[PDB]
Amino acid sequence: LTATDLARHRWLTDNSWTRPTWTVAELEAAKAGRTISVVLPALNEEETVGGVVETIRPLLGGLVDELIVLDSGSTDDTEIRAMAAGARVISREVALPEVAPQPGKGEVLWRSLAATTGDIIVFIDSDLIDPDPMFVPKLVGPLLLSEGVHLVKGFYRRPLGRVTELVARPLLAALRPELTCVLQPLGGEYAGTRELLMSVPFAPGYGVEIGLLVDTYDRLGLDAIAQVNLGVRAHRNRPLTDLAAMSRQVIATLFSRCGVPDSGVGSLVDRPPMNTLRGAALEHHHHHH
Amino acid sequence: TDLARHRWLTDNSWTRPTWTVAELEAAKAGRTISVVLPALNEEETVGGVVETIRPLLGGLVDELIVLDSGSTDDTEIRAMAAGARVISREVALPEVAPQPGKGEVLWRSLAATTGDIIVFIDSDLIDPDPMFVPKLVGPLLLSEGVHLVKGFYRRPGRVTELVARPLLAALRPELTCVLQPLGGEYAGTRELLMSVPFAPGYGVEIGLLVDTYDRLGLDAIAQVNLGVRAHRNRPLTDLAAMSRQVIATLFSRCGVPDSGVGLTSEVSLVDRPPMNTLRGKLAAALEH
Numbered sequence A: 001l002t003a004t005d006l007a008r009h010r011w012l013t014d015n016s017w018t019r020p021t022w023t024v025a026e027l028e029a030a031k032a033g034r035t036i037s038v039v040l041p042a043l044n045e046e047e048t049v050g051g052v053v054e055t056i057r058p059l060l061g062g063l064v065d066e067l068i069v070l071d072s073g074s075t076d077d078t079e080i081r082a083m084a085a086g087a088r089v090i091s092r093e094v095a096l097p098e099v100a101p102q103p104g105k106g107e108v109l110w111r112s113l114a115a116t117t118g119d120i121i122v123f124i125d126s127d128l129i130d131p132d133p134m135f136v137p138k139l140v141g142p143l144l145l146s147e148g149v150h151l152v153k154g155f156y157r158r159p160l161g162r163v164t165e166l167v168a169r170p171l172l173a174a175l176r177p178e179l180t181c182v183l184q185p186l187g188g189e190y191a192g193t194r195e196l197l198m199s200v201p202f203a204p205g206y207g208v209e210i211g212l213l214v215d216t217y218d219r220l221g222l223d224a225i226a227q228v229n230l231g232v233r234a235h236r237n238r239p240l241t242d243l244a245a246m247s248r249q250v251i252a253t254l255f256s257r258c259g260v261p262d263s264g265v266g267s268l269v270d271r272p273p274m275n276t277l278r279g280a281a282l283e284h285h286h287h288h289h
Numbered sequence B: 001t002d003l004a005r006h007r008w009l010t011d012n013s014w015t016r017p018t019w020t021v022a023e024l025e026a027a028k029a030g031r032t033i034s035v036v037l038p039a040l041n042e043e044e045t046v047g048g049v050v051e052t053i054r055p056l057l058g059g060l061v062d063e064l065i066v067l068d069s070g071s072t073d074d075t076e077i078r079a080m081a082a083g084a085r086v087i088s089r090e091v092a093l094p095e096v097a098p099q100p101g102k103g104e105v106l107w108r109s110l111a112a113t114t115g116d117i118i119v120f121i122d123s124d125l126i127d128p129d130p131m132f133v134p135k136l137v138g139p140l141l142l143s144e145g146v147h148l149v150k151g152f153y154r155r156p157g158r159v160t161e162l163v164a165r166p167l168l169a170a171l172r173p174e175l176t177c178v179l180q181p182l183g184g185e186y187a188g189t190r191e192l193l194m195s196v197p198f199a200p201g202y203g204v205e206i207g208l209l210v211d212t213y214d215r216l217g218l219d220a221i222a223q224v225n226l227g228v229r230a231h232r233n234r235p236l237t238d239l240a241a242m243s244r245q246v247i248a249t250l251f252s253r254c255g256v257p258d259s260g261v262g263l264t265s266e267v268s269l270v271d272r273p274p275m276n277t278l279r280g281k282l283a284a285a286l287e288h
Ligand SMILES: O=c1ccn([C@@H]2O[C@H](COP(=O)(O)OP(=O)(O)O)[C@@H](O)[C@H]2O)c(=O)[nH]1
Pocket: A041, A042, A043, A044, A045, A071, A072, A103, A104, A105, A108, A124, A125, A126, A127, A128, A188, A242
């Protein structure tokens, strides 16, 4: 047993839930004045965005205080379908007028920090085929009930992806081995506190998830990170060209957080902490005494 | 930088090698060629691979060796029947205790061979073609300044496209021109191979590629198409362990601190030293 194994074992005991079965009523009662914003990033998801919004809508006015689709420049019917399904639709330009947009998912999530007011922000992908209504309660459970948790990663069980298992987890094993305890570090369903999310830079495009995970870990360690089982979902097939581009950006973002230079050979920049434009900051763990 | 890749492809990459065996034999000019097949429990395929190379023995090829990596099946007996000399890891380098992995096997073969050119061919190949060795040694014999030839297959793998090529893009960007940097069929000069450390296990190919690039340059590397072959579907658990070691070896060659922590997998950051440090007199005898 290695030091990584030992930490993983205890981290799973304290910070991982295979059955995150908190009730909505219990979570509402735990808010204690805190508010919850749910953000769906969306670029051309007309076939699925309404279905995702529809699974979250029953929580509006209770557990969830706002439900926003942050549109990324869609040209299909994404925006109007999200409206009819009951979401608030905000463009990248309206979310943060003073900064010109650049492409990619990371830009959308970063801008959503300026468009939301919740003390807890939940991100859910708008391309999900089978969203489940309990996603949001499961993701916010540890933030509302567990001392010291600032980031919650939702993972799926598989029926009994390649970038995660060949790129992200092996690179974390090399560079930040304690983080190999996180089952799906690239997953798009996760939640965080405003205090954390406003204080960290946002990586562009496909790098935003891994960047947030390492930035959280480097400031607060394993104690601040939790994970919850959202249910059983089969892997979807993505073209190898897409996976290679995702891998290249995961590498670039991991390298930038871990002190490894990157050629830039494949143009998008990291965005600074939103508290430089709209933001009490997050207290890091002390490295001195 | 696309121009750099473009220039290299036109001079150092062959999609359709024209060379005949007779042409290559005439060009040897006193150089000798050793062919080494690493083998660990390959009883079903090692004979078929050896049989495709044996007709060259005594002509283009001066020795044909299967370096047995501790097999417990009929690998050794079937390799001898097909015409190869079988050499164990212990015999190849007796005073150094063996450690597991393919890199160990290829490194040790340097002490058991005499060729000015050494050709490595995997013993698990299902459809070996008799022109593999001729195509691999073509650029070494007929071009100037080439020291490492990488055999690639035209496709009709996930670790190459998701791990090796993107990491090279990040850390050795010129090397993304190499189509299949992890491929197990390749040839090198004695001068190169005797003088570089060998990475362990699954890292040996990428280690040799990067060390060759740094020490001798892009123009010392070539690649040749060995034919159309389909990707063999390996279990993702095997691919993950392979990826982890490719990462450790590239990090070792870049000075990135690698934890040495495996996947919950065997990973090593410890190279073997250049063989000319342990076999200095053999190495000097083979110079010039
Ligand atoms: O520039 C972008 C790219 C993606 N997305 C959204 O982010 C989620 C994850 O995107 P994905 O990684 O699937 O993008 P892909 O690889 O399909 O382009 C989906 O809900 C997309 O609609 C977005 O809002 N803006």
